[model samples]
Target chain A: MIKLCIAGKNNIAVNSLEYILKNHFKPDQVAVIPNKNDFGVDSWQKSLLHYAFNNHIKVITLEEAYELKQIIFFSLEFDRIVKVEKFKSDKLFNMHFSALPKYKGVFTSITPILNNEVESGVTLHCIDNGIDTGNIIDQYIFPININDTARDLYFNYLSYGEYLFKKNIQRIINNTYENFKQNNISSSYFSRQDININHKINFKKTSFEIHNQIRAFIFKEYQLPSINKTKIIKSTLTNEFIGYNMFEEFEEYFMISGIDGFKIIAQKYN
Target chain B: MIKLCIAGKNNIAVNSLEYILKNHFKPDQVAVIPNKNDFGVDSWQKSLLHYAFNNHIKVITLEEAYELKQIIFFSLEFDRIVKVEKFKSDKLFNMHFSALPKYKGVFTSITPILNNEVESGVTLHCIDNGIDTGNIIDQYIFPININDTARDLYFNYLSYGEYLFKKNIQRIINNTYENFKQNNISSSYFSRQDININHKINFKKTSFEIHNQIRAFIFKEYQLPSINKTKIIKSTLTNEFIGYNMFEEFEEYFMISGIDGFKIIAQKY
Candidate 1:
């Protein structure tokens, strides 16, 4: 019987599959259902299917994995909302980008930054029909530095996300992990349509808000925020007490202060 | 035209009405629609209707208050969800127990405490059709100490809530108060059906969660949480590490430790 099935995309899935095989399981004991867009090769990120194939590990389809009994199916950054009814065994899980009951829906990386949260975390929870709305098995909340951009937060999620996985994987394998129902009082959700990468920054806000907007949208893989008709790759905020509503253009950077009179230096992209 | 109408229950309403009258207007310049439960007298809590009547301030009906034009109608702990269309004026305000876009609905006193919140606050917002879901006028967020019970939070809400009201009343009256739309990304609400004060305490939780559950329900006006077949009026938690799952009753208190081995001194009612 296959003991584990690591599903989904990117380095986390590939690394987790590699770790499980190297440390816990053999090639024959584990299976993988890679992301739909994997294309059996690595690009900007590692592909799970390619790694699974290279190591002579079993690579199964989602439907095929369902037939297995008492096997754990874990999704890391998976694009699909799985239906639990199709599976006979109850051990289906996903790693969500924020702590349970807080950032439940899409664009968790950007939403928390935009909402002005000082921290974000990764949560392992049961897979349910609701988007990231499930009982949490485990979570690791980490601080979001004031200067950390979207890319920085993503890397943190991957790094700390892996740490949380290793710590809880044993409990999960033994079916000994404690799960708790998320309290509705603090629960919130954001839909895919809620955010637009192309949306212009409203500088009428405080310096902190404008800085958050720039940093939140700075991921090169996705999109970049613009300032003074130039694409901005990075934004640096400081407590230098600049004058309010000041705007000046420099050689490689644009200097702007918000309504609250805090300095913001926006680095233009190539 | 009447300049203001202070509505709702308890000390906040009476205090606000008195403040508004003393500073902003005369008895003839203000009207009130006290809480429906207000019996026209002060009992365990001060009655807004009695204060309005005793001071010769006009005690107007909800429907009667609706006829006034350009009046700032403020609801402080109002029990009803008011409809904006019923009123002639657009200026309808409310002092919600918790900060806007968070803890939007009922039992704001107990919900945040039960959720293990280290802070809670009061918000002033325009009264929309949705409960506590409106454009925010201003808010005052304050820290909730480890030992503060539901009652303590309620009193703080009244105090800070009044400060927020006084600070914003001039801007509100001048139509110059900046209002912000609450983002749905962080907005949350709880209904009346969500909590039951009659429920038994569950000790299987972490020391913090268990302690929160006991203190969150300790308001004497409401039912007290129970343990070992006795009622609990207060719950105090400490980092003084104790053995896990220990339960022992003393003469006036019950000493209980939770799953995390933290000491909980539950003062019996």
Candidate 2:
């Protein structure tokens, strides 16, 4: 008999995948290898352990994962990387947030947004020894707009990742799917510190550059710019008269000039 | 004879003031001390010299301005600042883009727009030793909306500036207008370089902020970023989806994410 192991931390993608797996197969036929690090507890509706207990499915450790024979493992939002030799299945696959062969590392959702990228997608690939350097099984590309926040982009990818898995699971079980190697030349990686704010506003840049910076930094705390010891939260561009021959001023908002000989409107909290 | 000398570069204010002066006084009675800079060659329909020639008015220099004994000088968009002792006019007044005791410097028209200010105005004041620190003679205040661009705002102020000058010129010449000193504390100055842009896109900002930035930067150059070397010329904020499950992508337009978890529609050239 073939056993299926759902490997991942607690997240919407993992929870939904577990539901789809149980509906398609018997509860006794599926086992779970939950991640030791619980990263999605705050965002997820319920704990994975709670779902496993209610369904009478066993929550096995990494050591127990090796004990199972002829097991097919499906990884969804799994935090830990699985060694190629540890998981005893030829059908090991991992889901990534970006289109494979581009944006291959941490904070994939944010990199595109910060780079002002026009598109982003999800990829399902065969797990290898390297981080996200696996052979691509399938990919679903989608359009991203200028207004999408990192959080919104991630959720969009999450849903699509689940959809891809549901559609391809049967092919994996039958061993009838094809895999392609990722192109190294077109790929890139980013670290956690890549998104860190330098907090320097250079006036020489065009209005779009300044505005894009403000948008990219607007996630956690408002993009705080220290001007005259005050924190600026919002801004715009204009050409109206501010004072005697001068077009820029520091009023309720900071009226600064742009490179295009126009004015930029910046708001600050008093 | 109390001759009126219009001292300044050629602009709408100077041209309109010339018309007002001509309508009130004889051609020889009004003298124009046109600035030698001649900056209005592009926008002016006719040269100041042409107007002076047609009207038989004397286009004088700064030295000629000092020769007039009882002249009431009206400076409109004047490039050079007159020393109090150099010109012989005790009745000297200048036009400013802001209300008295407020914004005082170059590019005054752009400051309010960038600040998202709701109100702006024009002031006519006595020309003193300091820049725009003269006594307030008259002012005209107006309302500003979000849709007003810096160019739109300037034209609005220009019309009002001309109106204030035309309405108050007679009183100013008659020495019947009341003048008040400006409060130094409430006044501020800005330079040409104040409106510089540092291009950085922060995804955490609200949709309004991102939209406003796009609006502010929409100029002749179409503020471009270094994204795949593509130039983004126009952009707008919308909740509409261009495609399925994708917040940012290239179609005829580019859709990116905002802080509100909605999509922003950006157009690129």
In every candidate, what fraction of the native interface contacts is reproduced? 0.00, 0.00
Q: How much does candidate 1 score in TM-score?
A: 0.58
- State the lDDT of candidate 2 residue by residue for A1-270, as single tens digits: 437777775454456557655566777777777767643344433466667766777777766776677787777777666887876666678888898766766677667655545578999998876567678989999976444445556767878887888878778778898898665233444556656666575544334334444444434322444555666565453433233222344567666543323345666666
Give candidate 1's whole-model lDDT: 0.80
User: Model 1 Cα displacement at A5 (Å)?
Assistant: 20
Candidate 1 lDDT, A164-214, residue by residue in tens: 778888888888999986653345556677688788777655566778889
User: Model 1 reproduces what portion of true contacts?
Assistant: 0.00
Cα error, residue A142 of model 2, in Å, equals 49
CA lDDT, every prediction? 0.80, 0.62
